[PDB]
RNA sequence: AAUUUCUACUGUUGUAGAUGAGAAGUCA
DNA sequence: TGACTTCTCTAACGAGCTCG
DNA sequence: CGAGCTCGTTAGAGAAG
């Protein structure tokens, strides 16, 4: 029987059921008449015009907290010393010191911000509404905008001036419940974490590493060039700009021209860093544009362009000075129309190309001159770095025709340079190091050429020539701008979406190409650019001339990845607008509690006429319909208005009502009890109120202070309806678990009848707006299975729920409304034969008596109802969930038949039920989805869309209509994974995407396979089966909670519940029977160096009766230690070889017939029947050894597509213990069948040894769930 | 080619499966 | 480029307000 | 300014590895 009987109703989560309202009776006629929904646009669309007001005031607060901060020089001298140690000498134990050196400067400001006076009333209610004596801070500044005559609008923003903004900001009087995600996603702007958009993460990582860099290029400038910077001219010329009102070390209030000898001081760090101080610093260092003289009076960086120009020294051009970047939330829009689909692009290629710079070098010539200055080795090669991730692999792709030739040369040269006989430092100098210099690259490429002939060289000059193939890409952009200027005169229309239709295919493919040769252009400069990453915080001895001109042409060119995603998210949408908004019935309280006592203001209540469900929203002004005297007066039959009783919090309510100004006399205790609440002695560790202090808990308190609550609850007027069943008060350890005694039992839901004729008349009177929630299950024309957001709603109100409560209703439901997006167009009229679209369905015809408008749910207005509920409310929460599982299946480990999912070359997954020994019980593909009614082949449905016999092969409309259908496949297949893990009650084991993941070209990408393990963790955390009994396990309330929730992809680790994780390195290229891995990689390193490598083979011999040659090897005679054992690989069957398609598509080559040819071509004899050891090693030729490697580039290839997309079977070199060779044309059911069946059976074998560790668990709860290749390659081979 | 929304649908005024919503700095 | 925060998941009371 | 009147305060567990 299923072992997961225990894993039922375990923890709590809150899904939100959504519905459509039906305006019934005369509900909609009163709404349109009084102007209700038309005056709802002005406070559900218009707050986006108020989110332009709040952030601008949130920008004025930046200007008046950073010009009001004064940080010490003690934490700048503790920064700048470590800031210059790591440049000249980077190490490990100073990174812990550098982080703590910058931790208490990003926290010392983070405690100054949270202790100001404009901050506590800015992320809460009181930002926008005024107190009776305290007028709020938004309305003061907009009046202060008039108090000084400032003209903040009609020059920068959308609103005319502040006078209409004075009207707009008073449209949110009691409406403070809007901004609660707009005021939660701006607590990251003042967050002390490492998130990359703040003002305290930025002034420690974007200007403080740039200002202290720019001080070393000023102390090393006055001694090396005294005459250069004319001090006496910049005092007179820019005297108005240099009026810095405050100094640091003297705290002057002297509005005077500062001295340039002291503005570059480390102590003077606080004279800037608002929006108007970085402007002042970048006025001197970049020049001041004043067009009153028709010339530029350019500052100190013009003096470097005069002093080093005359005497002609390019070492003072190393000492140029940089530009500080502009602060986050400066003064600087998602796309929906087509009037601005072109001028968000044609007004960018005017900005990225047609602009005159400061020093007069156009951006075509900047990458032209600098890469030509790098061409003949002029710049220093030990200061320009490569990004050491697999983006440098792409730099080896375009010119070296190999992926890992650079990453091996910086592993081969560093091997001989430091530890030439391999032991500790050898990894992090070239592998874990985030950057490698060109001097390290050049001394690794003119060393590998010394051990290689003329045919296969690897020249450093080709990398310099590859970068010279960059600066003429800007010339064909200047040719495409002559092509893409005839389209901007064709789209002058405002909102019509004729660039999204399928007729202009010849005008969208002129845009994807132009946004692809400016998106690999940024992916070839990506290997240069410095990263401000974490755990290394990358700082090295950088170049002084390269990385100042490169930042001119990267961070101005980097504004295309937030612009390429503004088009590919515009073309790949659907032709209707899902722009909905919430409607409120002239009330800031729509569904907040649903409670019976608090519903003249919660405004809403539900109904049931014994089959379907309704919503009744009372009109807020005349809401006197159900004030407890018209229910008994109108009792009868019909609707079944609920009384809903809720008690949120046994921390927040039970001291609020039992120690109030009213009910304190009704439950009168002695002063023995009153000393507890004052000093907070009942709490183990909490918070007393003002007046007293915290004391120590004793066991006498919370076995009698709870008894105060038992007499207080049992005499309450409206809190006797719950019927509490509290346990024995001696068995109460704390009040945190007496919370859980009050909170779950403080919830009842029973029914009271109302005569149907009254509340059919009050909707006719116009006081009860009545609505019906429905789906395709709550209509009368259905018989099949419901949805899951309708099988939950029918369990909020069932009687078997309310016995032992599971589905709790929550407050703050939210009513939404959606306008008319697309017009009504009947695409399938009545009595017309329509075409089938399934290649297995017999009934090819389709004639409908009723019409079908194309997706008509976006043609007519829909009132919505988004209703959060709570699942398993009575039970506990989620603490140490995955540790409970491993401590449970230890006595149930011999019931667990491990399921295992992979990616796919030909398939999409190959889920495989591996047994404990390893014999596959039931494997099947994941291309055929469904029960015997209809069957759908998503493999064939991909293969007709996936860039196959389609229009133009490159447009964005394909590559998401693959992906959304591929994502819609992920919505399908998670049910067919869930059915297996209950029928075969085991586990899921995916492939992790942290480290150790598969690399090749698959259908399922890296992107759309982490979502299939994201959409499985949120459909195995709460798992309901639509065809199971209600009160039985696996049903609706007694359902499957087997995993934990989803926090991040990083926090999945090796285990997040029943879904384990294993690596995905070397699982698809292994013989399943014996465990061979091709670790003896042939690459044709040299002619003579291969000769001792063929003697590292034990014997290259032949057998008479066997009839096949063999390359016997053992791994003890060569490095990169992976496994052991005498192999004697064979040359039995045929191996296909892939080729460059386009003709030269596919041809078959036999290994043995090639070995018969290529060995009889020279004088080597074989036919005696013994070893050919010395004969193969004795031969010396260029062509011979460059061709025998192509035999070993074929005898070890274990994937072979038979023709174009037919089938790829599996072959095995290494023998069994009998003599037979594994061949998947005759493989049994307990062995893999296809090529993707071998990439899934080893993901289970590497997952089955997780379960070997877990069944042998001990008292040490430090379960080594990590996999090393020495552990896996030993387990898979000798398991029998 | 119909849906609380999404994907494929004819599975027939809808069938099989998924659905956590308002939110939204945006790393790159 | 697809994920990075962590909450509100609420009833009752003391409050100045037409009214008494 | 008590009639109670629609508001904007306000009461303040112990999990979180």
PDB file of N, CA and C in Angstrom, chain A residues 22-40 583-586 617-622 625 759-771 863:
ATOM      1  N   UNK A  22     -21.289  37.163 -12.323  1.00  0.00           N
ATOM      2  CA  UNK A  22     -22.403  37.333 -13.254  1.00  0.00           C
ATOM      3  C   UNK A  22     -23.315  38.426 -12.711  1.00  0.00           C
ATOM      4  N   UNK A  23     -23.481  39.545 -13.414  1.00  0.00           N
ATOM      5  CA  UNK A  23     -24.500  40.523 -13.012  1.00  0.00           C
ATOM      6  C   UNK A  23     -25.908  39.990 -13.234  1.00  0.00           C
ATOM      7  N   UNK A  24     -26.605  39.654 -12.153  1.00  0.00           N
ATOM      8  CA  UNK A  24     -27.927  39.053 -12.226  1.00  0.00           C
ATOM      9  C   UNK A  24     -29.002  40.035 -11.787  1.00  0.00           C
ATOM     10  N   UNK A  25     -30.237  39.724 -12.175  1.00  0.00           N
ATOM     11  CA  UNK A  25     -31.384  40.535 -11.826  1.00  0.00           C
ATOM     12  C   UNK A  25     -31.331  41.916 -12.438  1.00  0.00           C
ATOM     13  N   UNK A  26     -31.075  42.916 -11.602  1.00  0.00           N
ATOM     14  CA  UNK A  26     -30.903  44.293 -12.039  1.00  0.00           C
ATOM     15  C   UNK A  26     -29.644  44.871 -11.395  1.00  0.00           C
ATOM     16  N   UNK A  27     -28.583  44.063 -11.341  1.00  0.00           N
ATOM     17  CA  UNK A  27     -27.333  44.521 -10.743  1.00  0.00           C
ATOM     18  C   UNK A  27     -26.607  45.493 -11.665  1.00  0.00           C
ATOM     19  N   UNK A  28     -26.436  45.114 -12.934  1.00  0.00           N
ATOM     20  CA  UNK A  28     -25.648  45.913 -13.867  1.00  0.00           C
ATOM     21  C   UNK A  28     -26.374  47.182 -14.301  1.00  0.00           C
ATOM     22  N   UNK A  29     -27.704  47.219 -14.194  1.00  0.00           N
ATOM     23  CA  UNK A  29     -28.442  48.399 -14.626  1.00  0.00           C
ATOM     24  C   UNK A  29     -28.280  49.562 -13.651  1.00  0.00           C
ATOM     25  N   UNK A  30     -28.170  49.281 -12.350  1.00  0.00           N
ATOM     26  CA  UNK A  30     -27.923  50.348 -11.384  1.00  0.00           C
ATOM     27  C   UNK A  30     -26.492  50.868 -11.472  1.00  0.00           C
ATOM     28  N   UNK A  31     -25.546  50.005 -11.856  1.00  0.00           N
ATOM     29  CA  UNK A  31     -24.134  50.387 -11.879  1.00  0.00           C
ATOM     30  C   UNK A  31     -23.866  51.405 -12.980  1.00  0.00           C
ATOM     31  N   UNK A  32     -24.340  51.125 -14.197  1.00  0.00           N
ATOM     32  CA  UNK A  32     -24.084  52.017 -15.323  1.00  0.00           C
ATOM     33  C   UNK A  32     -24.887  53.310 -15.210  1.00  0.00           C
ATOM     34  N   UNK A  33     -26.027  53.275 -14.516  1.00  0.00           N
ATOM     35  CA  UNK A  33     -26.876  54.458 -14.410  1.00  0.00           C
ATOM     36  C   UNK A  33     -26.262  55.508 -13.490  1.00  0.00           C
ATOM     37  N   UNK A  34     -25.817  55.098 -12.302  1.00  0.00           N
ATOM     38  CA  UNK A  34     -25.262  56.038 -11.335  1.00  0.00           C
ATOM     39  C   UNK A  34     -23.812  56.409 -11.621  1.00  0.00           C
ATOM     40  N   UNK A  35     -23.205  55.849 -12.664  1.00  0.00           N
ATOM     41  CA  UNK A  35     -21.814  56.138 -12.968  1.00  0.00           C
ATOM     42  C   UNK A  35     -20.833  55.502 -12.009  1.00  0.00           C
ATOM     43  N   UNK A  36     -21.074  54.250 -11.619  1.00  0.00           N
ATOM     44  CA  UNK A  36     -20.207  53.583 -10.655  1.00  0.00           C
ATOM     45  C   UNK A  36     -18.919  53.104 -11.318  1.00  0.00           C
ATOM     46  N   UNK A  37     -19.042  52.272 -12.353  1.00  0.00           N
ATOM     47  CA  UNK A  37     -17.866  51.651 -12.956  1.00  0.00           C
ATOM     48  C   UNK A  37     -17.111  52.622 -13.862  1.00  0.00           C
ATOM     49  N   UNK A  38     -17.772  53.666 -14.371  1.00  0.00           N
ATOM     50  CA  UNK A  38     -17.069  54.651 -15.185  1.00  0.00           C
ATOM     51  C   UNK A  38     -16.217  55.569 -14.319  1.00  0.00           C
ATOM     52  N   UNK A  39     -16.653  55.842 -13.091  1.00  0.00           N
ATOM     53  CA  UNK A  39     -15.857  56.589 -12.128  1.00  0.00           C
ATOM     54  C   UNK A  39     -14.947  55.688 -11.305  1.00  0.00           C
ATOM     55  N   UNK A  40     -14.787  54.431 -11.714  1.00  0.00           N
ATOM     56  CA  UNK A  40     -13.814  53.522 -11.133  1.00  0.00           C
ATOM     57  C   UNK A  40     -12.488  53.549 -11.881  1.00  0.00           C
ATOM     58  N   UNK A 583     -12.297  46.951  -9.168  1.00  0.00           N
ATOM     59  CA  UNK A 583     -13.418  47.844  -8.938  1.00  0.00           C
ATOM     60  C   UNK A 583     -13.731  47.851  -7.451  1.00  0.00           C
ATOM     61  N   UNK A 584     -13.989  49.037  -6.920  1.00  0.00           N
ATOM     62  CA  UNK A 584     -14.438  49.200  -5.550  1.00  0.00           C
ATOM     63  C   UNK A 584     -15.739  49.990  -5.527  1.00  0.00           C
ATOM     64  N   UNK A 585     -16.694  49.515  -4.732  1.00  0.00           N
ATOM     65  CA  UNK A 585     -18.050  50.067  -4.734  1.00  0.00           C
ATOM     66  C   UNK A 585     -18.150  51.277  -3.804  1.00  0.00           C
ATOM     67  N   UNK A 586     -17.346  52.296  -4.140  1.00  0.00           N
ATOM     68  CA  UNK A 586     -17.187  53.536  -3.372  1.00  0.00           C
ATOM     69  C   UNK A 586     -16.848  53.241  -1.910  1.00  0.00           C
ATOM     70  N   UNK A 617     -22.837  42.028  -2.727  1.00  0.00           N
ATOM     71  CA  UNK A 617     -22.126  43.215  -2.276  1.00  0.00           C
ATOM     72  C   UNK A 617     -23.162  44.294  -1.988  1.00  0.00           C
ATOM     73  N   UNK A 618     -23.340  44.615  -0.709  1.00  0.00           N
ATOM     74  CA  UNK A 618     -24.275  45.659  -0.310  1.00  0.00           C
ATOM     75  C   UNK A 618     -23.775  47.029  -0.749  1.00  0.00           C
ATOM     76  N   UNK A 619     -24.707  47.904  -1.112  1.00  0.00           N
ATOM     77  CA  UNK A 619     -24.360  49.297  -1.349  1.00  0.00           C
ATOM     78  C   UNK A 619     -23.963  49.936  -0.024  1.00  0.00           C
ATOM     79  N   UNK A 620     -22.797  50.597  -0.008  1.00  0.00           N
ATOM     80  CA  UNK A 620     -22.147  50.973   1.248  1.00  0.00           C
ATOM     81  C   UNK A 620     -22.905  52.063   2.004  1.00  0.00           C
ATOM     82  N   UNK A 621     -23.548  52.990   1.292  1.00  0.00           N
ATOM     83  CA  UNK A 621     -24.249  54.080   1.966  1.00  0.00           C
ATOM     84  C   UNK A 621     -25.501  53.576   2.678  1.00  0.00           C
ATOM     85  N   UNK A 622     -26.415  52.958   1.940  1.00  0.00           N
ATOM     86  CA  UNK A 622     -27.594  52.327   2.535  1.00  0.00           C
ATOM     87  C   UNK A 622     -27.381  50.820   2.702  1.00  0.00           C
ATOM     88  N   UNK A 625     -29.303  46.465   5.148  1.00  0.00           N
ATOM     89  CA  UNK A 625     -30.131  45.354   4.692  1.00  0.00           C
ATOM     90  C   UNK A 625     -30.090  44.204   5.693  1.00  0.00           C
ATOM     91  N   UNK A 759     -34.692  39.169  -0.982  1.00  0.00           N
ATOM     92  CA  UNK A 759     -33.406  39.523  -1.580  1.00  0.00           C
ATOM     93  C   UNK A 759     -33.392  39.355  -3.088  1.00  0.00           C
ATOM     94  N   UNK A 760     -34.526  39.001  -3.693  1.00  0.00           N
ATOM     95  CA  UNK A 760     -34.771  39.307  -5.095  1.00  0.00           C
ATOM     96  C   UNK A 760     -35.426  40.667  -5.279  1.00  0.00           C
ATOM     97  N   UNK A 761     -35.974  41.245  -4.211  1.00  0.00           N
ATOM     98  CA  UNK A 761     -36.568  42.573  -4.271  1.00  0.00           C
ATOM     99  C   UNK A 761     -35.590  43.678  -3.896  1.00  0.00           C
ATOM    100  N   UNK A 762     -34.645  43.408  -2.991  1.00  0.00           N
ATOM    101  CA  UNK A 762     -33.705  44.453  -2.590  1.00  0.00           C
ATOM    102  C   UNK A 762     -32.664  44.683  -3.686  1.00  0.00           C
ATOM    103  N   UNK A 763     -32.418  43.683  -4.537  1.00  0.00           N
ATOM    104  CA  UNK A 763     -31.609  43.919  -5.727  1.00  0.00           C
ATOM    105  C   UNK A 763     -32.416  44.713  -6.751  1.00  0.00           C
ATOM    106  N   UNK A 764     -33.744  44.572  -6.735  1.00  0.00           N
ATOM    107  CA  UNK A 764     -34.585  45.421  -7.569  1.00  0.00           C
ATOM    108  C   UNK A 764     -34.700  46.826  -6.993  1.00  0.00           C
ATOM    109  N   UNK A 765     -34.640  46.959  -5.664  1.00  0.00           N
ATOM    110  CA  UNK A 765     -34.627  48.288  -5.059  1.00  0.00           C
ATOM    111  C   UNK A 765     -33.310  49.004  -5.336  1.00  0.00           C
ATOM    112  N   UNK A 766     -32.204  48.265  -5.356  1.00  0.00           N
ATOM    113  CA  UNK A 766     -30.921  48.846  -5.697  1.00  0.00           C
ATOM    114  C   UNK A 766     -29.990  49.023  -4.517  1.00  0.00           C
ATOM    115  N   UNK A 767     -30.047  48.098  -3.559  1.00  0.00           N
ATOM    116  CA  UNK A 767     -29.205  48.166  -2.375  1.00  0.00           C
ATOM    117  C   UNK A 767     -28.270  46.980  -2.208  1.00  0.00           C
ATOM    118  N   UNK A 768     -28.540  45.853  -2.860  1.00  0.00           N
ATOM    119  CA  UNK A 768     -27.697  44.663  -2.778  1.00  0.00           C
ATOM    120  C   UNK A 768     -27.284  44.294  -4.198  1.00  0.00           C
ATOM    121  N   UNK A 769     -26.074  44.690  -4.588  1.00  0.00           N
ATOM    122  CA  UNK A 769     -25.499  44.253  -5.856  1.00  0.00           C
ATOM    123  C   UNK A 769     -25.181  42.768  -5.758  1.00  0.00           C
ATOM    124  N   UNK A 770     -25.896  41.948  -6.520  1.00  0.00           N
ATOM    125  CA  UNK A 770     -25.778  40.503  -6.428  1.00  0.00           C
ATOM    126  C   UNK A 770     -25.007  39.980  -7.630  1.00  0.00           C
ATOM    127  N   UNK A 771     -24.076  39.064  -7.369  1.00  0.00           N
ATOM    128  CA  UNK A 771     -23.226  38.486  -8.397  1.00  0.00           C
ATOM    129  C   UNK A 771     -23.166  36.978  -8.206  1.00  0.00           C
ATOM    130  N   UNK A 863     -16.657  41.015 -14.636  1.00  0.00           N
ATOM    131  CA  UNK A 863     -16.363  41.304 -13.243  1.00  0.00           C
ATOM    132  C   UNK A 863     -15.718  40.074 -12.612  1.00  0.00           C
TER     133      UNK A 863
END
